[PDB]
C-alpha cells in the first residue's frame, strides 16, 4: 500500500494526462462549430424584409 501508491498512481497520471490533447480537440473544434452555427444564424438575417411598427 505504501510503495504501491506510486505505480498505482501512475495509472492516474496516464488517465489525467490523456485528457490534455482531448480538451485541446474539444476547445479547437467546438469554437469552429461556434462560428459555423454563428454564421448559419447570421446568414438567416436577410435584407429583403417588411417594415412594421
Amino acid at each position: 500500500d505504501l510503495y504501491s501508491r506510486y505505480k498505482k498512481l501512475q495509472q492516474e497520471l496516464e488517465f489525467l494526462e490523456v485528457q490534455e490533447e482531448y480538451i485541446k480537440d474539444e476547445q479547437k473544434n467546438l469554437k469552429k462549430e461556434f462560428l459555423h452555427a454563428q454564421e448559419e444564424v447570421k446568414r438567416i438575417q436577410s435584407i429583403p424584409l417588411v417594415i412594421g411598427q
Binding site: 480538451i23 474539444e26 476547445q27 467546438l30 469554437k31 462549430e33 461556434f34 452555427a37
Partner: peptide, 9 residues
C-alpha cells in the same frame, strides 16, 4: 470554459 462555450453554442 468548455462548458461555457458548449452552453453558448
Amino acid at each position: 470554459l468548455q462548458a461555457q462555450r458548449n452552453e453558448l453554442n
